[PDB]
Design a protein around this ligand. Structure first.
Ligand SMILES: Cc1cc2nc3c(=O)[nH]c(=O)nc-3n(C[C@H](O)[C@H](O)[C@H](O)COP(=O)(O)OP(=O)(O)OC[C@H]3O[C@@H](n4cnc5c(N)ncnc54)[C@H](O)[C@@H]3O)c2cc1C
Ligand SMILES: Cc1cc2nc3c(=O)[nH]c(=O)nc-3n(C[C@H](O)[C@H](O)[C@H](O)COP(=O)(O)OP(=O)(O)OC[C@H]3O[C@@H](n4cnc5c(N)ncnc54)[C@H](O)[C@@H]3O)c2cc1C
Ligand SMILES: Cc1cc2nc3c(=O)[nH]c(=O)nc-3n(C[C@H](O)[C@H](O)[C@H](O)COP(=O)(O)OP(=O)(O)OC[C@H]3O[C@@H](n4cnc5c(N)ncnc54)[C@H](O)[C@@H]3O)c2cc1C
Ligand SMILES: Cc1cc2nc3c(=O)[nH]c(=O)nc-3n(C[C@H](O)[C@H](O)[C@H](O)COP(=O)(O)OP(=O)(O)OC[C@H]3O[C@@H](n4cnc5c(N)ncnc54)[C@H](O)[C@@H]3O)c2cc1C
Ligand SMILES: CC(C)(COP(=O)(O)OP(=O)(O)OC[C@H]1O[C@@H](n2cnc3c(N)ncnc32)[C@H](O)[C@@H]1OP(=O)(O)O)[C@@H](O)C(=O)NCCC(=O)NCCS
Ligand SMILES: CC(C)(COP(=O)(O)OP(=O)(O)OC[C@H]1O[C@@H](n2cnc3c(N)ncnc32)[C@H](O)[C@@H]1OP(=O)(O)O)[C@@H](O)C(=O)NCCC(=O)NCCS
Ligand SMILES: CC(C)(COP(=O)(O)OP(=O)(O)OC[C@H]1O[C@@H](n2cnc3c(N)ncnc32)[C@H](O)[C@@H]1OP(=O)(O)O)[C@@H](O)C(=O)NCCC(=O)NCCS
Ligand SMILES: CC(C)(COP(=O)(O)OP(=O)(O)OC[C@H]1O[C@@H](n2cnc3c(N)ncnc32)[C@H](O)[C@@H]1OP(=O)(O)O)[C@@H](O)C(=O)NCCC(=O)NCCS
Lengths: 381, 381, 381, 381
């Protein structure tokens, strides 16, 4: 119900302790220097936080997706870039392989990646089409006994750190979505070149680059599932990723609210603490309401996924509400902090820049509203 | 969890069937003619919907407050005035008596009122002070063996139909809240006169009047609890009423959304259904999300109350979010219907006028935000 | 510039004096009883307020459109239904005849209507299509020497009081807009039947009905301009009407703000006036800014029209901003008044219901945003 | 009226030409490297853009404040940091000296600063109090024939480039505002030390530091006006600065809208340009409406100042509306650009970070709403 089980409570406490011990001292350094936190990722792999959905047989933690959402929220509260790296590795790489790959592919592509030594990446977007995922131009000709890949992916998270890749290329151009086919591409491999890192406004610990495939050949076993199923795999992986991104936005909004409340209590204006002003109280009330409401939606989406029931509309609602709430709460936290919120000495601006991204990737807000509207009208029809 | 138990599902189905059978044909007539639906209230008392929180020993249904929230949402979806009458009788009259009254008072003031033959009313507000509940000017002098009541209450719901009253009068003026004392006043009684009915913008089935007490004397047993506890009784009854009003606003928003979606699918513009337009889809998506989020907040508040845990901040959040969401959804439904939404032939304007009230009574939105802000700052401190 | 000329100032003062003398005592009676204010319309015709754009040669006042906007704002501040009647008679009937009709048609259809004895109506909308104005199904066969009209118009303002009608019927069905042709139809005439009055949520002084044409024949001179120009005539008349409706929404928002400020200063809560609370001050500040900004937009649109320059985007912006600001200000005024705002004794709910309409007729907000977007993209291209 | 005079049109064209020639190529470099654009400031001084309000006798341009607002909007459209430097030098330094200083002080402190070789700074805020300007703790003891200054100012714009300073120190502590006294402090002078530059989220061309006064002595003539008038001088200078900041926010919103519209027309999604989507059109319409509405308010405030009439409420409204509109438009521009808007290669994120500041300095939005509310209630009383 509303309360959490003992395992979930213990995981929440452990994640909060780890976050306050490790991520908070280094978050500013990671943001400023664009430094990939290798040691923190290794420690998270040691704690099993990178393989929560993975069964314990394959080396994972064997936990439900609600526990994953809680851990993602706590980690993103600690550090946003570490949060998005964890979210990518947990959902976007591990989920499709467990859900669709054969047992040999699971053994060869999940077990090394549970320990945290290696991480994965999700390669769907292209420079030509960002939202229209079905219009991917990457071609995968089945010449000989190998899949020859030609094309250029873009915006690939963890491109400079991943040891594997889930690449979606259209085997058949005529088939807009049917042609789409997934492939498990090891990194580094001949024929694959990594693009230059992109300077980003917000999350800067993670490395974002453009994968370029030039006559890249992979063995025939590297195809995920069967040809044609690529679009469905992409959609389901996107739903799970949307749940993860909603958790990340919740964490960002929570830490922004905590910093704002602490500063408002500490700061003195007109001979009184700022909390005595009614405007500040109303701002805090609205922020808390938005944050809690979103958290509820997220938890509902996670529990619906755990009960093996359809959750696409719920996940889209959770992602949209969490992203918008995080942006509004971060903006109001900057406004409450005032002048001190603008300088980089205080962490409010980092929360603002990190919260801005949650409305862009994993489907923009317009795409989320399209999904919600379609499912709503289908429900009434 | 997210799912509902079998009893709750059966109650939801029964309430929906009763609503579609009875309330929908007569809602327009009730709104237009200011007609109190006596037969519908009697049938609801027959179904036990007026005594859900009451134990079965005293003649109630013995159901949890979550079931009460579900039934309130369904009834308010059927008809808003019937919804507010049910909410008043269930929470604001029955709850304080069960929570604080002695067993003899329970037998003499709850058992006749479970059947639906008689209903109660909550008398707190005064013309002088609406939000400042602690500034009530009604005086209750303890002369002789009877409590002599002098004063004028205002805005009393069901004043023209109630057979009992929960009246709060300040026994001690010096004590702003300590002086406040509750009293169980039977109606009609000598010394009590009912004010004229007030024409209202929205809910017009219910009768709202001003109770006037002129030397009204009641026996000494009619006092609820002990003197001084009146303010706490009022606050707890207000929390339960806020949960009920949140359920009512949810019902209004739900029926407005249903009518808007049906009309949008039926209406043809520019050679296409209105749902083909992206603006309509985005409006429907935003409306859906709002309602669902509010519902979760409401259900969380109800479950927290059922588990015997503090729920004041949760109830305030649920009431605020539900009221604002209901107003926004009703306005957008009128906008979607366009010209046909403006005339009284279509039920959109009735939903608008009924949804406007949920931000005013049971504490305005500013008071709710004050409560949320106070509890938030207390949580951080 | 920002200041007003002496003629405009004198007209503003005269309109305000007339409004406070006449419209304010009878506004509640007009709203409640659906009473057409014949005497007030006659007095306005005596003051020349119904023929402001009309040259003095034809019996008008010969004033610029800025003066018309000011007078419309003041009258709608006095009474909303009188405001919409004045707006219809000034813009939607008189403007197209002066702009496109020949001199004989001006003499036979403008000079009697300047005095205020008779008023006109604008017949464009149909039950089939409300926003898609080009899809009108009314047919005008040119049989013999007369135009035979068949079809059914809908939502015609002043249908029960108009002595003339501007009816737009598609002469050629193949021509979606080219077929559209305007006609000056006298009322009453054989073959024309008036539909039943429609009960409306808001403005109820004006009479809204559905014109039904059954073999209605008019002389050949009654056609406005030449066939095919009907759509352009409709668009320009709509622009002028949008300016008028923006002025009306400004008046409604202004009177709502005045009542809210007066009540907030008078009402006492927590031992202080409501204006001492910071939340009330912030609400009043937001309301004020909105109204003033909208007024400027309106005044800019009116001055651009007076200088014989294109004003379509400006008029659309003014109408959209004025309507949204009026709705928000009326809602906040009801919220500020609290319980007393809900009853019909206070005039806040009347302002709410009257302000709701300004987002529906003369093009809904979505159509206004489409016009603004089209003109913006055309400006950049 | 709505149109601009020939001088204003010529100044607008010259400012736009200069902006597109100089500021646009170097804006990204200035933002990235925190580089003070010395050459651009010198060229602006050559064009007279730094001394617009200054009479031509003292070496200024002798232009009205409307021309200053237009030039500020164009320059801030070119580059935001250059815009805020120009705004500070024009209003916050030059205005108080011309308005209150004697002729000798004008000759010794305005004529060298019109040419653009030297610039000024406005020193009011302190680390202790940011919004409560009357609680400044800087002390100015009148020992001997010199004013000995002790205290620490904060957030001083152009602290590392100014050759003069307007410092406000409380001569009399007992007098909260009466004690406040202004002083013209040359820079550099013995006893004055410049604090370290502060890394800021947005505008980074300008240098922001903390002035520290330790036994700084100035001649007796350096006091501006007479003791006690400091608070009034600060308030009037703040009003003029609010007009300038509103112009800057207008420029930022305008360039963000231009970039967003151009990208939306260029980008192709789902086989169509983005402008074909109705959601994009509605976003563009809302952005254009907000921008134009604000621009109007700003121009009204500037013209009211030029006509020697009170403009405090108008300036506060203009600043608030311009800041909020700029933030909303920048956020929507980032959303429209999508993924490409997030990287630093595109200029959308720079517009976002620069537009965030306009709600903080020159009085936060809460202070603006307090000023508007006070003037509104004073108007009704
Ligand atoms: C880039 C930049 C440049 C600057 N340049 C200058 C300059 O040239 N000269 C100068 O003098 N200063 C300058 N400042 C400082 C400026 O005055 C302050 O940063 C800003 O105006 C508010 O200061 P604060 O945040 O410290 O106020 P705080 O009092 O610390 O603000 C706390 C919060 O409480 C709110 N608040 C406070 N009192 C009330 C109230 N009564 N009612 C409601 N809400 C309230 C505020 O709005 C704010 O959100 C600059 C600041 C920045 C960031
Ligand atoms: C009080 C009143 C007075 C009136 N007076 C007159 C009068 O004097 N003369 C006259 O001719 N008419 C009059 N009308 C009718 C008026 O034209 C319509 O009521 C109104 O303009 C819209 O009509 P509709 O709701 O039927 O349109 P509908 O097409 O039925 O509206 C459906 C909804 O879809 C939206 N929509 C439609 N097309 C699009 C699109 N392409 N993109 C986005 N959204 C879209 C609309 O905004 C609306 O929300 C009056 C109406 C009222 C209520
Ligand atoms: C349909 C209806 C039914 C009702 N039924 C009942 C009933 O059964 N029992 C009962 O006891 N009462 C009932 N009431 C009365 C109800 O308590 C009040 O109408 C409502 O809760 C607020 O009262 P008010 O508007 O008079 O408060 P006011 O104090 O007059 O409100 C003035 C405004 O100031 C705001 N305000 C006041 N204090 C503050 C503050 N400290 N901070 C910020 N904002 C503030 C309020 O939000 C409000 O907007 C009913 C009212 C209505 C309309
Ligand atoms: C930090 C970051 C990390 C990323 N990581 C990954 C990753 O790991 N894997 C991956 O595959 N991609 C990744 N991406 C790319 C991501 O898919 C896109 O950036 C984003 O989802 C949208 O792409 P776009 O802006 O290019 O779409 P565009 O089509 O260029 O967006 C244009 C605009 O139009 C809107 N729009 C488009 N179509 C419609 C429509 N039909 N209706 C309404 N509005 C519409 C969009 O919402 C958007 O506002 C990442 C991007 C970023 C910024
Ligand atoms: C555009 C978009 C919303 C929809 O895709 P489309 O190709 O444009 O439209 P479609 O017609 O393919 O959608 C419905 C089809 O897909 C399938 N599908 C769509 N959503 C699905 C879901 N959530 N689960 C399962 N199947 C789904 C349906 O089965 C249907 O095919 P059918 O006709 O055989 O039943 C999708 O590409 C998208 O989500 N874009 C944003 C996400 C993103 O970029 N994330 C970045 C990762 S960080
Ligand atoms: C104004 C208002 C919000 C708070 O009341 P106040 O008298 O103004 O302020 P107080 O200082 O009394 O509040 C705190 C006190 O009340 C008690 N209290 C407040 N809220 C409580 C709650 N939810 N549960 C229990 N006790 C509560 C606290 O114990 C404390 O007293 P203590 O110091 O002995 O601990 C309240 O009057 C109100 O809710 N008004 C709107 C509700 C309404 O009108 N409903 C209409 C019915 S349809
Ligand atoms: C739908 C709507 C917005 C546009 O009309 P459309 O027929 O759907 O679209 P169109 O292609 O006709 O629009 C452009 C055409 O009309 C003409 N036009 C459009 N707006 C115009 C304007 N403001 N001024 C002049 N001409 C205009 C253009 O010349 C063009 O024709 P061309 O190709 O020969 O140049 C219009 O019908 C409308 O305003 N509806 C809402 C208004 C309303 O109902 N008011 C009620 C009165 S109270
Ligand atoms: C807090 C604040 C809003 C008002 O100041 P206060 O000291 O708190 O309140 P006061 O009582 O002094 O306000 C009214 C007094 O000041 C004077 N005053 C206020 N605003 C004025 C104005 N716009 N023009 C002239 N005089 C003004 C009045 O004369 C009155 O004094 P009186 O009683 O002798 O008539 C002001 O300090 C402020 O604007 N802060 C934000 C601005 C800022 O920080 N800008 C940074 C520069 S980039």
């Amino acid at each position: 119900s509303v309360e959490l089980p003992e395992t979930h409570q213990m995981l929440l406490q452990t994640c909060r302790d780890f976050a306050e011990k490790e991520l908070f001292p280094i978050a500013a350094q990671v943001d400023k220097e664009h430094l990939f936190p290798a040691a923190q990722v290794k420690k998270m792999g040691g704690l099993g936080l990178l393989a929560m959905d993975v069964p314990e047989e394959l080396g994972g933690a064997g936990l439900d997706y609600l526990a994953y959402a809680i851990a993602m929220e706590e980690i993103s509260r600690g550090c946003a870039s570490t949060g998005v790296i964890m979210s990518v590795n947990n959902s976007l790489y591990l989920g499709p392989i467990l859900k669709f790959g054969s047992k040999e592919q699971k053994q060869a592509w999940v077990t090394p990646f549970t320990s945290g030594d290696k991480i994965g990446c999700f390669a769907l977007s292209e420079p030509g089409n960002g939202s229209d995922a079905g219009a991917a131009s990457t071609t995968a000709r089945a010449e000989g006994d190998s899949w020859v890949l030609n094309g250029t992916k873009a915006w690939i998270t963890n491109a400079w750190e991943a040891s594997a890749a889930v690449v979606f290329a259209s085997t058949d151009r005529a088939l807009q979505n049917k042609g789409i086919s997934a492939f498990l591409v090891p990194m580094p491999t001949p024929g694959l070149t990594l693009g230059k890192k992109e300077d980003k406004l917000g999350i800067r610990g993670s490395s974002t680059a453009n994968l370029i495939f030039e006559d890249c050949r992979i063995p025939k076993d590297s195809i995920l599932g069967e040809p044609g199923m690529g679009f469905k795999i992409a959609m389901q992986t996107l739903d799970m990723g949307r749940i993860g991104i909603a958790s990340q936005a919740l964490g960002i909004a929570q830490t922004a609210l905590d910093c704002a409340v602490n500063y408002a209590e500490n700061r003195m204006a007109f001979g009184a603490p700022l909390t005595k002003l009614q405007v500040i109280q109303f701002k805090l009330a609205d922020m808390a309401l938005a944050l809690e409401s979103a958290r509820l939606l997220t938890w509902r989406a996670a529990m619906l996924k755990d009960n093996k029931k359809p959750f696409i509309k719920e996940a889209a609602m959770a992602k949209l509400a969490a992203s918008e709430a995080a942006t509004a709460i971060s903006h109001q936290a900057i406004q409450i902090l005032g002048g001190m919120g603008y300088v980089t000495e205080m962490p409010a601006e980092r929360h603002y820049r990190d919260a801005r991204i949650t409305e862009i990737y994993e489907g923009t807000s317009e795409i989320q509203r399209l999904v919600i509207a379609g499912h709503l009208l289908r429900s009434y029809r």
